[PDB]
């Protein structure tokens, strides 16, 4: 929880499954200790950063990265579903921005690399394809 706090303070983005992959903290007790720790920090007185990291995990060009940035912000403005945790919004945003071009990764490889369910990226790809209209940057 101290590492995650130091990550949130330095404008860095690290998912719970990453520190969880490093340390087995059993999630629940991790969430409670992180909550009461946040209360300690408050007593002593942002998903956009995740896009370039996963684009680095897939090795995508810069145009797909900033395209997933504009897609992430716009999808944050459109509402509907709102988020269901920002990780799935990130992976479906990169999934749409990569299905707009021709670089092929399909859904299984991106689902096993980023540790996301295929049915979730297709469930988000459905309504995302429904909102494809207002997501075009150029």
């Amino acid at each position: 929880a101290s590492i995650l706090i130091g990550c949130r303070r330095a404008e860095v983005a690290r998912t719970f499954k990453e520190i969880q992959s490093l340390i087995h903290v059993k999630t629940k007790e991790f969430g409670k200790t992180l909550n009461i720790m946040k209360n300690i920090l408050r007593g002593k007185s942002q998903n956009l950063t995740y896009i370039p990291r996963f684009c680095s995990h897939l090795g995508l060009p810069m145009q797909v990265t900033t395209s997933a940035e504009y897609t992430a912000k716009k999808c944050k403005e459109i509402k509907e579903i709102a988020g269901k945790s920002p990780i799935t919004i990130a992976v479906v945003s990169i999934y749409l921005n990569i299905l707009l071009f021709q670089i092929p990764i399909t859904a299984a490889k991106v689902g096993q690399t980023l540790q996301v369910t295929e049915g979730t990226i297709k469930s988000g790809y459905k309504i995302l394809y429904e909102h494809r209209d207002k997501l075009v940057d150029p």
């Binding site: 998912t15 719970f16 969430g31 408050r42 709102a82 269901k84 945790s85």
Partner: peptide, 13 residues
């Protein structure tokens, strides 16, 4: 209302 709210979408939408 940061002193009364606790929003974590990845943990609870």
């Amino acid at each position: 209302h940061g002193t009364f709210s606790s929003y974590e979408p990845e943990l609870f939408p």
